[PDB]
Swiss-Prot record, chain A:
Impact upon substituting residue 14 to D: Monomeric. Impairs interaction with BIRC6. Impairs ability to inhibit BIRC6 caspase ubiquitination
Coiled-coil stretches: none
Protein name: Diablo IAP-binding mitochondrial protein, cleaved form
Gene name, Swiss-Prot/TrEMBL: DIABLO
UniProtKB/Swiss-Prot annotation, chain B:
Subcellular location: Golgi apparatus, trans-Golgi network membrane; Endosome; Cytoplasm, Cytoskeleton, Spindle pole; Cytoplasm, Cytoskeleton, Microtubule organizing center, Centrosome
Quaternary state and interactors: Homodimer; antiparallel. Interacts with RNF41. Interacts with DIABLO/SMAC, likely with higher affinity to SMAC dimer than SMAC monomer; this interaction blocks the substrate-binding site and inhibits the caspase inhibition activity of BIRC6. Interacts with KIF23/MKLP1, USP8/UBPY, BIRC5/survivin, MAP2K1/MEK1, RAB8A/RAB8, RAB11A/RAB11, PLK1, EXOC3/SEC6 and EXOC4/SEC8.
Domain of life of the source: Eukaryota
PTMs per UniProt: Ubiquitinated; mediated by RNF41 E3 ligase and leads to proteasomal degradation, impairing inhibition of apoptosis. Deubiquitinated by USP8/UBPY. Autoubiquitinated; mediated by E1 ubiquitin activating enzyme UBA6. Proteolytically cleaved. Acts as substrate for CASP3, CASP6, CASP7, CASP9 and HTRA2.
Protein name, per record: Dual E2 ubiquitin-conjugating enzyme/E3 ubiquitin-protein ligase BIRC6
Organism: Homo sapiens
Free-text comment on this protein's domains from its UniProt entry: The BIR domain is essential for its anti-apoptotic function and is important for binding to DIABLO/SMAC and caspases.
Segments traversing the membrane: none
Gene behind the chain: BIRC6
Length: 150, 56, 50
């Protein structure tokens, strides 16, 4: 016999699950881009308040903003403790995707090879684009620094 | 208080979201004498038990 | 997310790495069994030709 029907209903369940997963990941990508932009803007806004507004106000607010800097730095480290695992999970995702591309090229499944190549390319584009928004904000911060210094 | 049935209640923390944790039971102290076989025959077996544990 | 969810994500990372390793080992095992069978078949075919 041929296992084509077995593969057919297996991948039918897989495609239903991954269509639900694709809608869920569209929603979760909206959530993730929102959270990532909020975190980057929080970092840059606290840097801006650290650099731009020292000495204009009185002494009590000076001590207040200093304690705010200390506490917010601690809380930002605590919140950013989640981002260290994102790099490693993207590392393992990239490795697994490259393995899938190689294995599908080896087996010869053209649809699976295209799926794995576009999988690594798409995860690369998504992670590099959220990181690209972050580094665009960082580059804007550096440009504002070099223009403010000179 | 002359207690026979005992109940324990817990209050969670608003800032805590964990589901599973361990809470100690603690220690409970209380004798079994109630008076405003408690008659002097209550010593009959207590003395024997004390003597046996003293031999041990 | 939570502590249990953080443990889930950590074990997800670990199991994804070990599943990369497991897929490599399993594909190697399948290819080795294929080479096993094909070498036996080739030897039998040569003997039959002789």
């Amino acid at each position: 016999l041929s296992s084509e029907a077995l593969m057919r209903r297996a991948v039918s369940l897989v495609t239903d699950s991954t269509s639900t997963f694709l809608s869920q990941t569209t929603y979760a990508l909206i959530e993730a881009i929102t959270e990532y932009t909020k975190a980057v803007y929080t970092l840059t806004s606290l840097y801006r308040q650290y650099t731009s507004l020292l000495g204009k106000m009185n002494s009590e607010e000076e001590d207040e903003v200093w304690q705010v800097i200390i506490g917010a730095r601690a809380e930002m480290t605590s919140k950013h403790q989640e981002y260290l695992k994102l790099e490693t999970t993207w590392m393992t995702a990239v490795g697994l995707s490259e393995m899938a591309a190689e294995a599908a090229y080896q087996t010869g499944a053209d649809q699976a090879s295209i799926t794995a190549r576009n999988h690594i390319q798409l995860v690369k584009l998504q992670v590099e684009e959220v990181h690209q928004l972050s580094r665009k904000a960082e580059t804007k911060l550096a440009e504002a620094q070099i223009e403010e210094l000179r | 208080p002359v207690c026979r049935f005992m109940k324990i209640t817990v209050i969670g923390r608003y800032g805590s979201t964990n589901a599973r944790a361990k809470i100690p039971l603690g220690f409970y102290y209380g004798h079994t004498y109630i008076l405003p076989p408690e008659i002097d025959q209550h010593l009959a077996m207590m003395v024997a038990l004390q003597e046996d544990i003293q031999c041990r």
